[PDB]
Structure formats: structure tokens, C-alpha cells
Amino acid sequence: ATFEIVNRCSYTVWAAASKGDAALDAGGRQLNSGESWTINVEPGTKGGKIWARTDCYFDDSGSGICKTGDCGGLLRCKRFGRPPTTLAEFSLNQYGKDYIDISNIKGFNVPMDFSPTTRGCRGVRCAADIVGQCPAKLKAPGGGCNDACTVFQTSEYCCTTGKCGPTEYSRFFKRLCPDAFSYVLDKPTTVTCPGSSNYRVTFCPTA
């Protein structure tokens, strides 16, 4: 399948694409403002993620640091990144359908549109100034708006017992992006698409 990753923000990002224990495609790439990067994701891949990283440095050998979303110091992510990261999430071809979501469960760093480029299903978006508004205790230094489970480390915010409610903090994310997951047991805003669809991720879509 095809992922076209478009940076419509006015600042450079370092896109990432991982499933958790391996890169997707090249696993990451600088995208200056306006630049695009199309990747190939192997059919059926379950649980993949695409995110932006901000304020990075990488050396010649690709190793470095980013202030949001860092995946173990690699330009080319083979693992997931450090919150706060807005997440595009997907599992493809799982019995005749792909399922797409955007998640604020690890926080938010960059607004995002995640729309199918082939018919049948509707995209999802979170474009609101979450970082401009973000509650003080959830602010990150380094940039972005952390989730409560990162900042506090409780069973209720992390949903560790499998029983958790919405919180004042989950609801701050759901007031501003009702189509994105705001905590682990949120009512699903998943989208079911035909198997083997293609997609576009766009950062700073309003921009």
C-alpha cells in the first residue's frame, strides 16, 4: 500500500513510520515545508503508526535527538517515539478491511489529517492549537502537550486495570479533537476502509 506523507506546516518535521519492532519503508525522513515522502507498507502490517518529530538533529551517521517524538536517537525509526506525539494509526487488510485512526493517547505535537487516497471511506483529522491551550501540568518543555498517563503515571490515566473513565485531561483532548482517541477506553473513532487502500497523512493541514 501507499503512504504519501505531506509536511504542510511552515516548520520542518522529521516524519517517522514504525510498527513497533521494525521500520516501515525507510523509517523516517526530513520533510522541509511543502515536501512529500511516499512509502510503501507491506500488506496486512497490523498496528503501524506514522508521526512527526520536531526540533531534531542528526549526524552524518543518522543518530541524534529530537525534542518531540524521538525513536531511540535514530533518523530511521525502527521503534515508536517518545510522547508527546500525535499518532496516525493503522492495521491493513485484517480479514477484508483496513482500520484507521488518529490517537491523542500519547499526547499531541503536530496537527494532522489522515485521509484515504482511494473511495469508500472518510478520513480523520485533529487540527485544533492543542499546544496553545494545553493545560500547564501537561505542557511539555521541549514542545507539545503530553497525555496525563505520561505526566502522572496512574492506573486511572493509563487504564492499567482495564477499567478507567474519562478524566478532565482526556476530555481537554476530546474538546478539541472529537475524531481522535482521547484515552485508552475511548469510544472508538476508528474508520474501516477497504483492504489495500492508499492514504495521505498531512501535517499542519490548515496551514
The residue count of the chain comes to: 207
In units of Å, what resolution does this entry have?
A: 1.4
Domain residue extents for the chain: 1-207
What grid cell was written down for 54? 520536531
For residues 12 and 29, what is the distance between their CA atoms, to the nearest angstrom? Answer: 11
Cβ–Cβ under 8 Å, residues 107 and 145: yes
| Nearest Cα residue to 184 out of 197, 169, 205 | 169
CB 106 within 8 A of CB 83: yes
CA–CA separation, 44 and 94 (whole Å): 6
